Amino acid sequence: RQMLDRKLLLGNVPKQMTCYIREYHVDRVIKKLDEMCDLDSFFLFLHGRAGSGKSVIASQALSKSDQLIGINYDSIVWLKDSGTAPKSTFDLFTDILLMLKSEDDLLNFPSVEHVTSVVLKRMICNALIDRPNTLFVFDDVVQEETIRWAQELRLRCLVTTRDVEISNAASQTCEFIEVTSLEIDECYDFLEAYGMPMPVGEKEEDVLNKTIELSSGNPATLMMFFKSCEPKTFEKMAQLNNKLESRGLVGVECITPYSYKSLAMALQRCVEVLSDEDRSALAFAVVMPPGVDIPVKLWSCVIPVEQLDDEVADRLKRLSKRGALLSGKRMPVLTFKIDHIIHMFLKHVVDAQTIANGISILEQRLLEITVIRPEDFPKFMQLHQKFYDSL
Amino acid sequence: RQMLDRKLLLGNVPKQMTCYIREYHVDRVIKKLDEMCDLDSFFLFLHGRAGSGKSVIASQALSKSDQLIGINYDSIVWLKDSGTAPKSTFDLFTDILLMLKSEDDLLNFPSVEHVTSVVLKRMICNALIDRPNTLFVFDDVVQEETIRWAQELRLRCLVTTRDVEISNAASQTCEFIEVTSLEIDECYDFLEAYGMPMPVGEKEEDVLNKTIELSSGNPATLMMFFKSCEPKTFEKMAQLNNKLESRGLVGVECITPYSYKSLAMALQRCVEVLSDEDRSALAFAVVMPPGVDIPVKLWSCVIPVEQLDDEVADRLKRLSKRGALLSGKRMPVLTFKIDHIIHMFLKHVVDAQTIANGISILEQRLLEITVIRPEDFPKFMQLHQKFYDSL
Amino acid sequence: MLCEIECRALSTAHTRLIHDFEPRDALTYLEGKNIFTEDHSELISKMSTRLERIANFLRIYRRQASELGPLIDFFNYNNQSHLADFLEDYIDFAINEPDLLRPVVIAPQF
Amino acid sequence: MLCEIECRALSTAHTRLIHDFEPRDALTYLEGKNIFTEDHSELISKMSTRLERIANFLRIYRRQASELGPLIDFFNYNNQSHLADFLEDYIDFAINEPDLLRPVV
Ligand SMILES: Nc1ncnc2c1ncn2[C@@H]1O[C@H](COP(=O)(O)OP(=O)(O)OP(=O)(O)O)[C@@H](O)[C@H]1O
Ligand SMILES: Nc1ncnc2c1ncn2[C@@H]1O[C@H](COP(=O)(O)OP(=O)(O)OP(=O)(O)O)[C@@H](O)[C@H]1O
Ligand SMILES: [Mg+2]
Ligand SMILES: [Mg+2]
Fold this sequence. Notes:
In chain A, 45% of the residues lie in helices and 9% in strands. Chain A has helices at 3-10, 26-34, 54-61, 88-100, 117-127, 145-153, 184-193, 202-215, 219-228, 234-252, 263-272, 276-283, 296-300, 310-320, 340-349, 352-364, 385-390, and strands at residues 42-45, 75-80, 134-141, 157-161, 173-176, 294-295, 327-329, 335-337. Helix content of chain C is 65%, strand content 0%.
């Protein structure tokens, strides 16, 4: 247990969390990895929402079990991607060449600039010999070119990302683990871990479920709410929820182990990458009942673009498979839902005009001659008047 | 006691003050450091106001006890930060790479700057094996990114700063020691040490008192004033104090060991870093009685921005944390106090007109419709007319 | 590789490894117990001063061995047992009895 | 001198020789059975902590005795027989059988 730490540090792996540790997942990211010791050049995707906590889990999954390093894999290489430029997918590998290199000849390291891709790639798989049992962690991928590079060099990978569609380019081993919103029961533990005041009075307990419904299981902005509650009182929590309904995440924004002071700063990046036409779809999602199971035709009313109303649903599926911006279900009827967090993001970001504009469009299509059934009453349903008033 | 000096000099640690020493604090910065040996990677914060004398104490705490160097820690690395640019948090470590390096191969120094961080970081923790239990002193941290890297480097270091928020981004536990304003009894000692007309007469004693008041115990500005006593006369001290409540530190500015000849030059930097919207809040906080315990509502009157007047308190707490500009007493009632030193600087650097309008707004909100209690007497301008008439 | 405990020992017991020791004496015993290479012994064996052969032996060594065994099992055989005894004492005041290392085996040489 | 077997035993049964034992108790019995010297007993007898007297008793001992007899024939008499029994068991699972562990795992 002292050799790991040597190997963790040198593979640039961050320290695992201790206050709060997820289990089932970490225990599911280790299992699948053991099954693949024999297998080579495989992808493990920790696909999840932003600030949803994926990167922390990789820190822990490689830090609890000592088998992963020493027993199952000889060495670790953990590199943060976050590449947006077209030179980024090449630059990552230059940083992965020196990583793999010896402590000797970092001073004699030549110019990778002159080195071409066919050379950086060949140059890597040429020194990769001295490291047969090597796992690479690619914290925060937002591109596919890297996946192509990996398929080309025949290589192993843990991958933390928000957009899950990147894997489509590859044709090799691909498995998946989704970092969901923190379940209700769990949250408690998280706050308990952080010594959040314990629920006692029904009214105080009343606050309890609400922040969750809002924070919809986002660890980062839960950490942010904690950084906000210095007073450490349910009253403080209530006041912060109030600020949020009037200030969005900006109100809860704060310094934290997250590289980000505000979650809106994070999600930004999830709204830039979006297909130009898909960006719109998201932008109008603001005028929807938050955290509510609502029909497709219901959305067809605010979303831009005949019998081909399926296209709207398409938009809702694509948008849901990119940083988990959207969430939809199959049964009983095809319905999606705008997580409270994303809804708030949209509201605070979209043109103050569009919000009204979108609701107006909803009204334009609002007329016609948990078990919500507006299939038969869409024209005359305003069950979310409360939310509608918010607009 | 001759080996230390070798180690102090090479770790770039400044000479400790000998004429006058804040023993309790120096004796509290050494204690806490001894307690941390087995534990690796720890932060010690000496958070304090500008020129509160923090950096001098680290010079002394590593210079009195010889145990700290040799017995508790093998070597010392003392580096001044003061980084504002985004390249600064990287540049500090380039200067901490060569520090750690051998006298040999400073010749073969490569373009470490033209190397990626993942290399400077790996390159550092690759040579850090040469020196175990190494202590690093980071005189004057302003940014928090350094901490982010440091925690990725599993590092343990002492830290002189004017703020404390950065720890939130950190997640490896921290301890703290605050350099307070020099207590009344202490000050005396400081003067005598530096040699001052010994306080003897009544009117004089009463004249020597006034002096401290303005400085309000700020060591740096308690030094900058002492240097304005060429006549070595208490009479001269009275004269200078009088000049202050008019011209301000500007007139009392002088060449001193300290980085800033004028304290206003120092505090500047504490007013630039300040949140922009939060910057405004502060800027209208120059209409309150100096060195007076005064209520939150009385403040709600001059400060910019429903029962959310708590927003005033949030600004006053943050402002009191960042740069320790303000200070809030929890009991009996939530009240802050604009320290004369924290009061004069702002007064002189800001707009009197703003203060004039500001004073007007204060009076207005007060009218509304040491045991001060304006809860039932908010509209009490005459209370500090001596202060208010100044405006 | 070693670690902070095993390397802190080679460092604490350094005032001593300078007064009586020689890396040439140990090179044969270590090319043997499989912890060196015929360039390693070349590099430490042709060095004008001993503080050179010593600093290279302690540098090269900290990288090569899985542990600090084949160096106690040598100061014994080399009639330098007053050395292998000090280091085995130090390795013992860490695993079994913690705390006692600083009062007992570390302070009497300040 | 002893050897790897007889010294591997004093080492394996070490977690135990720390919890209950004392070199002062054995010094008289060993200055006697001819395995010590009046400086030996001085060196191990004046030691502040016991882990000192123990580490010196186990260092000094491994050099002096032709075998591991006069230390089983002692934990017996000292009411510490749960010790001399463990060590005699260990010397037997090697004396009566020609097979052990090889270079393995
Ligand atoms: N198990 C945990 N314990 C404590 N804090 C957590 C945990 N999981 C997430 N967080 C919070 O989230 C921040 C980092 O989130 P994390 O990096 O784990 O999410 P992420 O999915 O990587 O987001 P991204 O994909 O944007 O990197 C931490 O600073 C902390 O505030
Ligand atoms: N113990 C002391 N003896 C003499 N002068 C002192 C002492 N403490 C502070 N000073 C004065 O302050 C100046 C340096 O202050 P110091 O660097 O100790 O404060 P600081 O908290 O580091 O400020 P900053 O955070 O801006 O570095 C000295 O030149 C001296 O004038
Ligand atoms: Mg991350
Ligand atoms: Mg300074």
